[PDB]
Design a protein around this ligand. Structure first.
Ligand SMILES: [Cl-]
Length: 334
């Protein structure tokens, strides 16, 4: 029984969101007192998501979007699979490390466009249809330890995750870098279908009218669980600043043990230079669900601490938003 209210966004805001977000064609919902933001299919799948059955040997990665999720998944999958680089290379990360709630973001009317554009390839069409099915069905069938990615906040996780004490890695990333990266995610994924500029996107993000917002409630919930024995909380910039410490610490949290030589191969694999050529960074592309015109940011990233999309006005608003939300907490980005 799904315990929280699911209400459509107020009529006029909902109308404006549909003008700017072409990946959704019915509308957007806000969930419970914190008003967690989702497209319409959340209402259809809320019960089946919430009653998903975690296992005590599951490894969950829980992040706000573009908070180091793909890099962490690659690091974690390898640490839990005896550094099997060959298997990691040959099987896509989306199969090795499925995304619990991706199916929320495949609207029937957008799916029909994808199918039209791939109508002459039966395998492409099966792939697209599967995107719209819950990952939970194939996860439930697995008889080996599972690796689950989600952006669902702590308060919307299946209660079975904490009941079973499944291990959770929570990664937090500073809101300036999240805003710019999440903007690019919204342009890259036609399931989002965002058409506007960075400033219009920041306006939505600051109002918690982007999926999995409120951002600050996401971070605070993660911070409020980090003391549990089955939760490891890290800041994105700390993880990237010291790969050897990140790898050892993560390995230790997961109950795994590796040599200096093994830690070194994992540092090489996860180095920004090599990771830029990793398959998990570049299937979605082949059926044209990724926008091939938006691979600029994928190839190049942002100028560190001064994204070209950033304006002094938006910088100042990010500072004030940060102050309002972190005042009277001990949360501090590196
Ligand atoms: Cl950070």
């Amino acid at each position: 029984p799904f315990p929280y209210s699911i209400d459509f966004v107020e009529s006029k805001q909902n109308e404006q969101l549909l003008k700017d977000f072409h990946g959704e064609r019915t509308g957007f919902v806000q969930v419970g007192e914190k008003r967690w933001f989702f497209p319409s299919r959340f209402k259809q799948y809320a019960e089946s998501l919430y009653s998903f059955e975690a296992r005590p040997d599951d490894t969950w990665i829980v992040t706000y979007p573009r908070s180091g999720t793909t890099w962490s998944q690659e690091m974690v999958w390898l640490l839990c699979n005896e550094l099997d680089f060959e298997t990691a290379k040959s099987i896509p990360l989306t199969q090795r490390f499925p995304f619990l709630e991706f199916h929320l973001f495949v609207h029937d009317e957008v799916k029909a466009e994808f199918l039209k554009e791939n109508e002459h390839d039966v395998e492409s069409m099966k792939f697209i249809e599967q995107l719209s099915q819950p990952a939970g069905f194939m996860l439930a069938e697995m008889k080996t330890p599972r690796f689950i990615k989600t952006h669902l906040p702590i308060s919307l996780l299946p209660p079975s995750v904490f009941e079973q004490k499944a291990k959770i890695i929570y990664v937090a990333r500073n809101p300036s870098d999240v805003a710019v990266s999440y903007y690019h995610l919204n342009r890259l994924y036609r399931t989002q279908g965002y058409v506007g500029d960075f400033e219009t996107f920041y306006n939505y993000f600051e109002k918690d009218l982007t999926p999995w917002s409120p951002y600050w409630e996401h971070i605070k919930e993660g911070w409020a669980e980090r003391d549990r024995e089955n939760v490891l909380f890290m800041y994105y910039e700390d993880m990237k600043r010291n790969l050897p410490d990140t790898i050892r610490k993560t390995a230790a949290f997961l109950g795994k043990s590796f040599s200096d030589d093994q830690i070194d191969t994992m540092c090489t694999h996860l180095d920004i230079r090599n990771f830029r050529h990793n398959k998990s960074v570049t299937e979605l592309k082949a059926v044209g669900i990724l926008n091939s015109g938006e691979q600029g940011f994928v190839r190049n990233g942002q100028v560190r601490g001064n994204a070209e999309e950033m304006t002094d006005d938006i910088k100042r608003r990010l500072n004030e938003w940060t102050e309002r939300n972190l005042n009277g907490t001990d949360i501090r980005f590196p």
